Each structure stands twice: as C-alpha cells, then as structure tokens.
Amino acid sequence: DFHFSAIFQPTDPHHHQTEFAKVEGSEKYVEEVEVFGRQALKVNPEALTILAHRAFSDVHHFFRKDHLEGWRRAIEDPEASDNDRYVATTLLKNACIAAGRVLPSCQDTGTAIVLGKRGELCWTGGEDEKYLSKGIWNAYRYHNLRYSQTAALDMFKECNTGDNLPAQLDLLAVPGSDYEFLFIAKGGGSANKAYLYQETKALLNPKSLRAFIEEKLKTLGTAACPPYHIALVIGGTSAEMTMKTVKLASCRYYDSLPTTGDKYGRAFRDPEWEKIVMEVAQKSGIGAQFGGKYFAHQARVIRLPRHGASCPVGLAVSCSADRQILAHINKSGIYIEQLEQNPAQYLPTSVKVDLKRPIDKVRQQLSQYPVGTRVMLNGTLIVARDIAHAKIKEMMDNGEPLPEYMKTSPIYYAGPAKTPEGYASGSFGPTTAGRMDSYVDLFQSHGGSYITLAKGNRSKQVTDACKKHGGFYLGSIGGPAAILAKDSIKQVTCLAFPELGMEAVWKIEVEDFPAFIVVDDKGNDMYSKTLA
Amino acid sequence: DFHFSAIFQPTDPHHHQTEFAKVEGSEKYVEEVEVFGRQALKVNPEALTILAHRAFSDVHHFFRKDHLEGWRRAIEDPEASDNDRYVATTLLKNACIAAGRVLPSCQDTGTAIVLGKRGELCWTGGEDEKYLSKGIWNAYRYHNLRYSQTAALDMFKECNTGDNLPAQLDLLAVPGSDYEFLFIAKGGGSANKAYLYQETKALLNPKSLRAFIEEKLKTLGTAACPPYHIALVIGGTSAEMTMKTVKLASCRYYDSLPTTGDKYGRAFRDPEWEKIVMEVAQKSGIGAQFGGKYFAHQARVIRLPRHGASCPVGLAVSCSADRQILAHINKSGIYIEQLEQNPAQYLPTSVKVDLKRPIDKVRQQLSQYPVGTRVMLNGTLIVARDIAHAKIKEMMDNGEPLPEYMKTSPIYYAGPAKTPEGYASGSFGPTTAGRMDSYVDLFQSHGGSYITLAKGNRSKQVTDACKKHGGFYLGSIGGPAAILAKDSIKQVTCLAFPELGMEAVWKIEVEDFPAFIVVDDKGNDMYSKTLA
Ligand code: SF4
C-alpha cells in the first residue's frame, strides 16, 4: 500500500527552540483573514523589506550561542594549544568590537541568501523577490558592509555590481498561512569549502567511511577560518539536493531531525558519526588555524536516501563569520532570531618586524626565524587579490613590467568593507591565500611578491617558489576583520584599479599587525605535518 | 538607485515553444475564484496525482525531438564513425521498442524529480507532496518500471523502498495563480556524472577555460551512455545553486535565457562557448561510447554571477535515457508536454562467442582478438552489481570462498526492471562498470569474474588485473535496455540473494547480445588513447 514519507521530518519544524524578537509595531503589516473557510494571512510586502534589512544588518554584529561557546571552549580547554587559545581569544575580541554595530565581524559580508517558505494561504502580492532584494540592498547600502558580487558582462569581462546584489532567493511553497525564513550572509571562503563527491556502495562501511572522513577533512585545511562547523551529508536524491542539505546542516537548520532511519528512506542525523567526525577533527592536530585541537566547533552528519546506482556526498563548513538568522511572519507580525548581543561574557612572545625599510632587509630579518614564529608587522602593506593579480599577470604577458608597488612591500591579500564615517578603515581582514598560488612563482621570478600576507594553507608550488626566490608567506589570523581595522590599520588609500571596488589595489599603513610565518625561504611549511 | 534584476530572465518563461496536450476533461479539477480583488485558482489536489502519474509513465516510452534528432545526426553525418552510427541506430531501435508502451527505454527508470512552481494564488489544499508522491507511486507500481530507491535504516544498513519513493519534490513559490512543473526521471548513471568544481578568477580566460573544458569532459568518460547533452555552468551564488542550474540546463530548461550579461549580474546562455564545448567533444574522439565524433548531442553553457572570492563550476550530462516533461495546471485544466510518439521516422561484422563452453575456452577465444573487436554473446550470464559485489566481498572478508556461480559464466553488471506479463524479461541493460572496479582483481585472484560485461571506461586497476589473470572486460552498448530485453534476453531466474530484489544475483540466458572487447588479457584498453 502507498505510504507518504517526507524525506525531512524535523521534530521542531518551526524552530521553536530558537528565541525570536518581534519587530515593534510590525503587526500593522499583517492581517488575518478567512477565505473559503480557511485561515489566511495578508502580508504587506513592505514587511519583507523591513525583515531582510534588519536580518542582513544584525547578522554582521552578533553571533549564536553555540558559535560563541565554541570559542570559549577553545580558550578554557587545558588540551587546547597556545595557538588554539590565541586565535579563539582574538576572534572573541573581534566579536566584541562587531557588537558595537559599526564594524561588521568580517570584511567579507558575504552573499545574501534567503530560504523562504511561503504558506499556501500567505498572500504577499507575489513580488517577494523584489521586496526582499530591496531590504538586502538597504542593508548593504546604508551600513558599513561590502559589495562582493561580481557580474559577468560576458564570459570573461566582469564588473562589481556595486550593491551586493543579486541575492540567492530560494522561495518554497509550503502548507499554511505563515512565512518562514532562514537568512544566510555566506562568506566566499566557506562557500568555497563546499564539496561534492560522487561515491559508491564501496564507501558504506565503517572502515572506508572513517578513512574517507580523515582524507576529506584535511582538504578543508585552514583556508576558511576555522574553528569550523563541519557538515557531512551521505547520500541524496541528486547532487544539488545533497549540496543544499549540507549547506542547511552547516547552519544547524536540521538539528531536530530524527536520529534513526526507516524503510521509507527518511533523512536522519547520525550523532555517532558526528562524534567520529569530531574525533577526526581533534586528532588531526590542524587546530584553530595554526595547530592544535580546535579544528572544529561541532559536527553535523545527515544520512539521506539514495538511488541504488548513486552515492553523492557533501562536505561543507560554516566559518568564523558564522552568520544565519531564522525569522518568520505570522498573524502577530515580524519575528527575527535573537542573537547574542553581549559576546564579552564568553571571554574568560612575538618578533617585531619593521616594514619601513628596503624589502630585502625585511626578507633578511624573516630569514632568521623558523616557520611558526609569531610576528608583528609595522609599516606599509600593498593590498591586492584575485582580479588585480590577474590584471598584473596579463600586463606582464604583454611585456609590461611587474608594477613598482608589487616590489616595495609585503602583499596583503584583502578587500575592505566600507569605511565608517570618522574611521581610518572599515573591516579589513585577509582573504584566502591559495587562490593566488598560481602567481607567486611568476611574480617572484620577476622581482616582486617576495613576502605575501593572507590566511590559509598554500600549495607546494608556493613553498618551492619561496625557497627558490627567497620568499615568505605570512599567515594572518583569519576572521578578525573588525579588530584589525580598529587597532592595526591606520591609513587606507586606493592605489590602482579603483573600478574594481574592494578588489582595487590598496596601500595601507599598519601597526601591531599579527601574523605567523607559515612558509619560509628554505622549503618549510608550518602545515606540512598536519595537512600533508 | 535600487534596481531589482532577477538572475534568471528567460524570454519564454512559460515554455510556449514546447507543444502541450490537454488531459481530457481535466478542467473539472480547477475553479476560478476571486478573493480580495485578485484572481485565484482552486485546484483539486487529485490533479497533482493524475499529472504526476501520466508524466512518470509517458516519459519512459517517448523522447523529445532534439534528442531523437541527435541520434539521426549520428547516423547521417559523414564524419560520424562506424561505431557512432551503430550505437545511434541501436538507441533509435530501442526507442521504437519503448514507444510500444510496455518496456521502458532504460532499466534504470530513475529517481522521480519534480520541480514545481505554485503561484501565490494557486490553492491546492497544501498537501502537494503527498498527492504528487501518490501519482509517482502509481506510475512505478502499475507499470513495468523499477524500484530504484535505497533507504538507510542506519548509516550502513540499507533496503530498497520497494516503490521508487521518496521523490525529490522542489516546490517553489512564484507569482500568479497557475502551477507549472518540470518532471525528471533521472537515471543514476547520469546523476553520478554531475560534478562540482571550486575554481578561481585564474580560470576565467579563454586559454584556461578551454584547457579546463578539455580536461573535465574526458573525466565524464563513456560511463553515462553518451551521446550526452552536456551542460556547463560557470559561476553561481552557491554550490547548490550552481548544481541546480547545471541540472536544469541539461534538461534544456534554460534555453530561452538571454545571451549577454549586464551590470546587474543576470544569468546568460553563452552560444560561443557552447560551440567550443561541442568542438572539444567532437575532436576528443571519444564518440558515442566506442570512438568517433558523437560524444555529445549538444551543449548548454550558462554564465552566472559570483562572489569575488568564489567561482563554483558545474558539469553535468543528460544521458541516452533523456527523460523530462514540462507541464502546467491553469484555468483550462492539466497540460502535459507532447513527446514524439513515432521515433521510427528518425531512422534512415562481429565475432560469435558461445558462452555455453567452459569459461576457460571462452577466455582463449577472446584472447585471439584485439580491443575494439565487436562480439555477439550467446549463453549464460551471471548478473551481479554493486550490492551483490559488496555482500560477496564481505563474505570473503569473513573467510568464505568466492561462490562457485561467480566462476562459471561472464559477470553481467545489471539490474532489471519489472517483467511485463508474458515477457521473458523486463528492460535489462547494463550498469556502469567503474563502480565494480575495486572487486575485479580480488575476484580474479580467487578464480572468478575473469570476464565482465557492462558499460563505460574503467580504471587502470582493471586493466592491470585482466593482464595479470588473463581476463577481459566487454562493453555492452549503454542504454538500449528495451531492445536487449525484447530481442536478446531469453530467460531470467533468480540465483542468489533474493532478499536484495533487483540487486539479487540473476542467471540469464541471452542470444545475439552485442558487446565490444574493451580490455583484453594483454594490458590493452580501447579507451587508452581517447580517455588518457
Ligand atoms: S571568516 Fe574567513 S572564511 Fe568566513 S567570510 Fe570571513 S574571511 Fe571568509
């Protein structure tokens, strides 16, 4: 006989476990009505604008308890490494500055993603995408955020959209008369650490699955600012369904799923394998960015049904900029998830490097120290990331020289958020180093980029280049963009390619800028043991 | 200054270019009403059951014109290889059998996927997933299809759901009062050939993108029954959005997108790079499964916006079992895409191998011929695929011998659809060989699986195993499950593991079963040059 079984059967489908605050007076935007014997809700679409604006504003200044608890856990655990505690302390202090509501917690204020669930009898007028986008436009336009969306004018010619649009708007049709939401301000770095694997039945035994987890977790590296929320999805009805599921799992959206399967193929959370993932993460030694125990905050493992011929697998993280907000509109008005507004309650030996000298003198000083040495940088950084590197390579391919500004100073891979009025800099932390790896040997061979500054482990070609050319790669802490802006960055100037927005070349003056020597000029790599 | 721009702006959003048929009398399921000044449509949810039942029945017996035209092109093109023409003729003859409405075109009748777009004022009662699932249940229960879904009772313990449920039900909230659908009966083999790559700005130039396409197309190999509809998506707002987009592109759902980008980041189809994909596919020499020009029917390339730090890329195919159906419900009733009911209008030596001999004598005969030799098999095949291979390896890990029935006959990797009344067998084509690669050396070392029969290129370990043990891998044509059942398969009996259903070990008798020698007993592989 026919028996319908929904794949996802959360015991808390409306997220009653979350605390919400009502937007004051927002009941003026809704009206409960009764049509053809059923309860319906008229919603002024302006409510969607109000809600998206507040959500994509608040989420940049506050965090969830389970995120903050993880940093405090990394500080208080006796088994944490010194680097574990240093990174976690820095990120918590960063969260305290972001809670001042001026600087966002990360310079990468993310892609705006909306998961919406509009009830059959929730009536908005139907222009939901436009009104949601206007609220997002408002949040990024009128706050000290960043325009991160790159439009393709043709296959290769690109420009910044200048407003952080378009958003990803996934609006679903569901029963009832309410409107439920998950808003995600998704950073590019953690979005890049969402992986799809095509596997087989040969994986589905304890030994093979454990080895698989050990292998794949290492490929995450430190490039998305751990401690991670690690999500793992085994199975799925299609690649895109698996990847949607691992995204939502990383947002703890499926925490209330059943924990056992059944003959109808329902999804379930697997706490036993979450514990195994956490054991792999801890024993890896990768740590909170620079070696230790706190590679991961927590783990979510969801087992899904599969076509007999198929076994898609998804792996994804939520990064230090852990930014999602639940919300709903009902007959009483607009409700938005309450984040922690007082992160301070969760709070329970370096080499001074003067950059104000010839770059060869800085290289000689750095050459005296092993990888893993904590440094503090004082002086000028030249800022350049993906597009500027591509333009400079193209210039050199046409016979033009490597520009002078790639030869005078360490290269900081970064793109700033907008500068608050009266501030020296907006949030201005690093971007992922690995994306620039293909340029390092080329640029060093042409007399520049000897010292680079960013975050994440890099490929072997960069280790070889630094040894061949006497270069260095310095790893900044990943994520603490607001405290770096408040305490370290003293002057910001646009140097070249202003049309690229945040991806322009910048010249900045910094003081007390912390970093680790990750790659030296001798073939050493402080990630060589944990990530290889 | 705010301008809303939807990412996807098809010029034919309601698919007017597609021909639809009305379900007779279906206007009885809908009623136009007016509520708060707005036009709404009441839809009896039984309409969803009727529509899903007809869609997931019809799609297994008929094809779209552009699919059939591609097979005809492979026969009539002077540049098609002889093997191109042979394969395309076989697939067209298979489609003629399937159009008889008894045998489905492929034994893998797929995962049932519904993309639904319910208007704000389309009122179904809200139980859409149950009623859609009942229609899907009806189609797979009451027709000669296959139950292909595998439930996870725990992480590793699995069972078949016995009804091809659960479906993938992606129901979206959209403007208006209609209900629009794309139904996809997605085979597992092509679902497995959906890949996500995390790339960078360094890819976004003509030389790098061309080399990337050349590299990735080869990794598709022949294991998903080409000629392929190849879809490539560059960019996207998230991994899951990229993979959803490449899925829909492969179904030609986005054919009416604009062909230029703009400063707002709208998606566009790129005809120039579609031509380049087709040039790469044709010049690859991979061909329609066995060498030649017709690796691909056609190509779709969508360029998407991206976060500056991100460049997700999706690559996916639609296989020979190209199965999708558009539909909509409106004030006039239920409309469903009209597929081609007369595929015959598109229609314009070998070595006899007796399998009824000692397996060692069959090995000696096969040893006389080079790879690429076409053979015609007559006799017994022992049928076993993923689950049976895993269970047999598990038995051996527990000290049990390889069963005798794995040593007497060639091993056919396949799983049959249900047997029509009065037929010797239901549709019964091959399964992808690569998924069994990890078993071959082990099984041959214990005296069995010397000759295997399936589809697709295999890994080096199988070539090395066949050379070490005097084995062979034979490639059946991929896809022609109905004509194989009708013409070649004369008897089917369950031999072992009846509890596994479709994945039990079968003993079948075949006549005039065509295959190519893909791997011989000498280290040769007919794909070594095209898939190097
Ligand atoms: S915390 Fe790190 S990975 Fe996350 S958005 Fe910010 S820079 Fe990117």
Ligand code: SF4
């Ligand atoms: S056997 Fe071939 S045609 Fe059939 S679903 Fe699998 S890949 Fe597609």
